[PDB]
Write a protein that binds this DNA or RNA. Structure first.
Ligand SMILES: Cc1cn([C@H]2CC[C@@H](COP(=O)(O)OP(=O)(O)OP(=O)(O)O)O2)c(=O)[nH]c1=O
Ligand SMILES: [Mg+2]
Ligand SMILES: [Zn+2]
Length: 1025
DNA sequence: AGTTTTGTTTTTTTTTT
DNA sequence: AAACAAAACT
RNA sequence: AAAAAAAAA
DNA sequence: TTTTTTTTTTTTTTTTTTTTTATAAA
DNA sequence: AAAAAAAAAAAAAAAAAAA
DNA sequence: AAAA
């Protein structure tokens, strides 16, 4: 079965022929003998045909010379068989060499192109580095399976039969009891879309809407069974979009899809931590055609606009703008309530749906859509999509016969996640409505359910009655929906006053009782909240230690190892902070940094100080992650939710009410409270507040009355003023006191405000007028806001909040450090200005795109290398002499510049610089640091000079302690290696005009100095000429 | 008149289901 | 994390 | 070796 | 209930002690 | 020579006692 | 070498 090889899309001739035939197919064929649904499948056939004809012809053309030479040679050598002739034996000898020459040159180019690709990526957070830490990928196979007979057997046809028959059976059984489905849907109260929303769903698809979905498709994904890639649609979107628009208009009008839209390829994924050999345990992941996914993406985006009307905020999975940590913190707060409660009769139950996406009954799903009020062209298209889907299973690369998908949503489809949620929402609403399933009461809050996708947790009081009624309702839902739970795999915490009472409830109920802990959404919930640190954070330290211990001999530098910590460790650390932001002891951070540094410096003491690595300005953009500042950024982030005061955030309201419940709405940018006994038992919120204050006083802010103080605040309420006035001001004029206006602008800022001014309750203006015009009020409110205050007040999106706060914290806590560039200036007798020190830092960033070349420069400037002077101090000795043996004292400036063994190389480089007909002083700061005197600071030739100098640095460093001269030829080899890596990358990225500028002059000079012997031995030949 | 800063956009990997 | 472009401050 | 949302660099 | 004193914790600064054996390539 | 760690000082918040 |  064919696939498009994306490499063909690059090639100038291939593109021109395809663009020509796409025009020619549609102009010829398009008429009313054909439906557009048929015509689209006919187009794809012709297009797949032409790619095959183009690929084959291209491959012939590339081989034509060796084709000819091999034919011509064998002809002459058969002439040898009758009579053996000297001149022919010469001619045969000549050509047989040239055949071997061409085969060599093709081989080398393939190696150099591969090395060039790796040279761009090395030590970067990219697929190569990610693959280095991971084990070898698998090619999925079956050779042994466990049989319907109960046998473990290995016959190839018997496995193909046993797999297919099993998956065919899973999807086969569609329910038929439509009248019972209606009865369940009438039993309960459900939302409805209104006429404006429904009109939005059914609106005509447009050409601009299609191109936006094409632009966003994920590159480097497998194609569907027809073998066209996302890269194809992106390449030809100019031709394809007019015809695609005609396709979707025809589907809207008729509700008939093309036959290919139904097709999908199942590949079998083994589930984590379970048997391969059981057919029981695989996940079927589907590949669909890209044209069908374009349509399905259109429909999913439309319904996503409305989804918050349909789905209650107890569901956070798949929902835009929601967070999984919302459910984790809510659940921990409920568990604390039970721990505190004097009379215990309570249960917490974790439930998961078995094969949830596969077992949804499609007729129930379509009835649900109508009941919510979705009908018209949108419902018509959804019904067509489910009319007859089929799968083929691809096993060991072989394509099995196809079966119908009569249950389930399509498990690799963009529309399937939302459709599953809408169906599950019918059960969620029914549980909330039913009052003999009793929730837990937390002051003014009742809590019953939290959902994440198909994952469900339930909070009950008086479980003996309440849990039985829950099970009964789920049975009724199962009969109509198809949804099913495994009750034994469902885990519960049970709380009772006596052991007798526990034994009764356990006897009656089907659930598994967890004494210590339940794993949930990535974390451990504990039966007592005291345990949170022990179960979550202590295990996380132990797991990081083992992980770095395995990696300890991995072959990358300290630069690459820093990136490994960022890529692999940092995400799981942040996730745990965000789920459970409890006060952590200082020893936790001490152990985490010791472990991480010991890995980066390969169990040897650091070569560069962690102080210098702290800031991006220093060390060329390599930065070490600060775990304490990430912890502070996560704890402080909660304050953004307190200021927003959103009705969806029930997780924030859930902490112990005991003295006073409202206070968190009043804390931020609002007046200090005398009472200091709120939050006595707070797990999260009290620690958040203490961190917020400490940062504000570090900044020397007054946090308590600000340009962002709300009208809905204690400041206005301690003025004893009627809520009708408060609401009037917000309705008319906006929410901040600065929107009212203070001092001389009290209402006068707009006519709309003075239009408001008369309206308000008579005496309350005199109260307001006094406060708003007071001398202290004008001073505090009129000041300019800081960047810190803008984070919490200004932004309507929680998006990207940890990264903003962390960037502020790094400036607030910015430390002083030693500068290596100053020590260089002392090793030489010279002063570097601020402009010189700026040039050194920029150069260390901009010397290359490759981290390989950048690392070498960074090590040179930052004084990485050991010296005899340093080593004699360490060993407590007086033998500080140059290791090369020239007899002088081994300072760092001796080792790089001044040693007589190194000096002949540097003079060689200055001879080339005269052949480029530059002129530069002979000054160690230019090649080692990148600091030029004030004339040459501008010059265009610096990119050439940078390549010459960094090549010299490599040559000297390679024989650092050796009693021999660095040679000129080793220097030319390095400079030619860099030239080669840059050439293939410059083509791949279409940069060849830049490349020719830098290298062209230098390349001519390198070739002029070598002999033909040397050029042959070291394979030095032009890639430009 | 010149350089630095701030924001958006395109590309990588990891977390949950 | 990088690059590019727009606006303000030195 | 596919889908959705979220997070960081 | 309010104000002042005392005690504890955290963060920053300064001084003292210890190191590593060459490096880049892989 | 250079980096890290330990020790001491300084400041602010919280608690208890007195006015 | 650490991809497709
Ligand atoms: C992990 C994962 C999940 N999904 C979707 C589709 C199903 C739901 C539920 O997945 P679940 O872990 O419950 O598994 P489930 O299918 O419900 O089977 P069991 O719950 O193990 O019976 O999430 C997916 O599309 N891709 C994935 O890689
Ligand atoms: Mg499930
Ligand atoms: Zn020397």
């Amino acid at each position: 079965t064919w696939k498009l090889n994306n490499l063909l899309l690059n090639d100038y001739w291939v593109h021109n022929e395809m663009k020509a035939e796409i025009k020619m197919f549609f102009e010829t064929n398009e008429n009313k003998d054909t439906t557009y649904q048929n015509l689209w499948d006919a187009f794809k056939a012709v297009c797949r045909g032409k790619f095959i004809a183009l690929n084959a012809y291209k491959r012939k053309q590339e081989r034509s010379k060796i084709d000819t030479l091999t034919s011509q040679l064998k002809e002459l050598e058969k002439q040898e068989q009758t009579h053996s002739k000297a001149s022919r034996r010469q001619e045969i000898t000549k050509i047989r060499a040239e055949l071997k020459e061409i085969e060599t040159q093709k081989t080398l180019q393939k190696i150099n192109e591969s090395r060039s690709w790796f040279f761009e990526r090395i030590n970067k957070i990219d697929r190569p580095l990610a693959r280095l830490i991971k084990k070898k990928r698998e090619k999925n196979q079956i050779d042994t399976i466990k049989n319907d007979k109960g046998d473990i057997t290995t016959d190839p046809t018997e496995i193909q039969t046993t797999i297919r028959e099993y998956y065919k059976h899973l999807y086969a059984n569609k329910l038929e009891n439509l009248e019972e489905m209606d009865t369940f849907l009438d039993t309960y109260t459900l939302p409805r879309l209104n006429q404006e929303e429904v009109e939005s769903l059914n609106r005509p698809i447009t050409g601009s809407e299609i191109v936006a979905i094409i632009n966003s498709l994920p590159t480097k994904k497998s194609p569907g069974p027809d073998g066209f890639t996302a890269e194809f649609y992106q390449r030809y979107k100019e031709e394809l979009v007019p015809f695609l628009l005609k396709l979707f208009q025809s589907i809207e009008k008729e509700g008939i899809l093309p036959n290919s839209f139904y097709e999908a390829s199942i590949i079998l994924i083994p589930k984590p931590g379970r048997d391969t050999t059981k057919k029981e345990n695989f996940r079927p992941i589907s590949l669909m055609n890209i044209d069908a996914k374009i349509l399905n993406k259109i429909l999913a985006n439309r319904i996503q606009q409305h989804i918050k009307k349909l789905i209650h905020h107890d569901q956070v999975g798949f929902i835009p703008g929601m967070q999984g940590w919302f459910n984790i913190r809510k659940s921990i707060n409920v568990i604390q309530h039970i721990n505190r409660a004097k009379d215990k009769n309570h249960m917490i139950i974790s439930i998961d749906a078995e094969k949830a996406f596969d077992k949804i009954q499609q007729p129930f799903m379509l009835k649900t859509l109508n009941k919510l009020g979705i009908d018209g062209t949108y419902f018509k298209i959804i019904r067509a999509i489910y009319d007859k889907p089929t799968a083929n299973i691809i096993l060991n690369g072989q394509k099995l016969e196809a079966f119908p998908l009569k249950t389930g949503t399509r498990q690799g489809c963009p529309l399937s996640p939302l459709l599953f949620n809408i169906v599950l929402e019918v059960l969620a609403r029914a549980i909330r409505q039913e009052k003999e399933i009793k929730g837990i009461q937390l002051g003014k809050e009742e809590v019953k359910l939290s959902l994440f996708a198909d994952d469900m947790i339930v909070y009950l009081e008086n479980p003996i009655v309440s849990a039985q009624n829950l099970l009964k309702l789920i049975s009724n839902f199962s009969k109509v929906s198809g949804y099913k739970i495994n009750v034994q795999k469902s885990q519960a915490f049970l709380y009772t006053n006596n052991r007798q009472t526990e034994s009764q409830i356990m006897g009656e109920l089907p659930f598994t009782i967890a004494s210590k802990r339940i794993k949930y959404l990535g974390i451990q919930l504990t039966r007592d909240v005291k345990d949170l640190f022990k179960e979550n954070y202590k295990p996380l330290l132990k797991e990081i230690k083992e992980e770095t211990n395995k990696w300890k001999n991995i072959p990358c530098s300290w630069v690459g190892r820093i990136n490994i910590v960022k890529m692999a460790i940092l995400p799981k650390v942040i996730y745990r902070f965000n789920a459970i932001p409890i006060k952590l002891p200082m020893t936790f951070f001490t152990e985490l940094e010791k472990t991480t540094l010991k890995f980066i410096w390969n169990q040897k003491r650091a070569r560069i100080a962690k102080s210098i690595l702290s800031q991006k300005n220093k060390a060329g953009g390599i930065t070490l992650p600060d775990f304490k500042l990430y912890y502070k950024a996560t704890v402080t982030k909660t304050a953004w939710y307190w200021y927003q005061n959103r009705d969806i955030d029930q997780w924030n309201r859930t902490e112990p009410s005991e003295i006073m419940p409202h206070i968190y709405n009043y804390l931020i940018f609002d007046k200090p409270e005398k009472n200091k006994q709120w939050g006595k038992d707070s797990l999260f919120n009290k620690w958040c507040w203490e961190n917020w204050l400490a940062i504000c006083r570090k900044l020397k802010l007054d946090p308590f009355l600000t340009p962002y103080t709300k009208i809905n605040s204690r400041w206005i309420k301690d003025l004893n003023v009627k809520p009708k006035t408060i609401k009037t001001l917000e309705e008319n004029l906006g929410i901040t006191i600065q929107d009212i206006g203070v001092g001389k602008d009290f209402m006068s800022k707009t006519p709309k405000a003075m239009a408001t001014k008369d309206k308000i309750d008579k005496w309350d203006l005199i109260k307001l007028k006094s406060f708003c015009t007071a001398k202290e009020t004008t001073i505090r409110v009129n000041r300019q806001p800081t960047t810190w205050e803008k984070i919490f007040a200004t932004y309507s999106s929680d998006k990207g909040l940890i990264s903003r706060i962390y960037n502020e914290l790094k400036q607030i806590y910015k430390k002083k450090t030693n500068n290596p560039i100053k020590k260089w200036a002392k090793d030489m007798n010279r002063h570097f200005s601020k402009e010189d020190i700026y040039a050194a830092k920029k150069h260390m960033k901009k010397c290359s795109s490759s981290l390989a070349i950048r690392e070498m420069q960074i090590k040179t400037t930052m004084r990485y290398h050991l010296t005899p002077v340093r080593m004699a101090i360490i060993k407590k000795s007086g033998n500080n002499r140059c290791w090369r043996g020239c007899g002088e004292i081994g300072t760092l400036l001796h080792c790089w510049w001044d040693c007589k063994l190194v000096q002949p190389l540097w003079k060689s480089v200055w001879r080339f610089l005269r052949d480029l007909e530059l002129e530069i002083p002979f000054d160690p700061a230019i090649p080692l640091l990148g600091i030029y005197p004030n004339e040459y600071k501008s010059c265009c030739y610096k990119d050439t000079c940078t390549r010459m100098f960094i090549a010299a640095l490599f040559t000297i460093a390679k024989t650092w302690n050796q009693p021999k001269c660095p040679t000129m030829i080793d220097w030319i080899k390095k400079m030619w290696h860099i030239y080669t890596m840059e050439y293939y990358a410059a083509i791949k990225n279409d940069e060849f005009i830049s490349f020719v500028g830098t290298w062209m002059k230098l390349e001519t000079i390198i070739l002029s100095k070598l002999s033909q012997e040397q050029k042959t031995k070291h394979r030095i030949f032009s890639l430009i000429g």
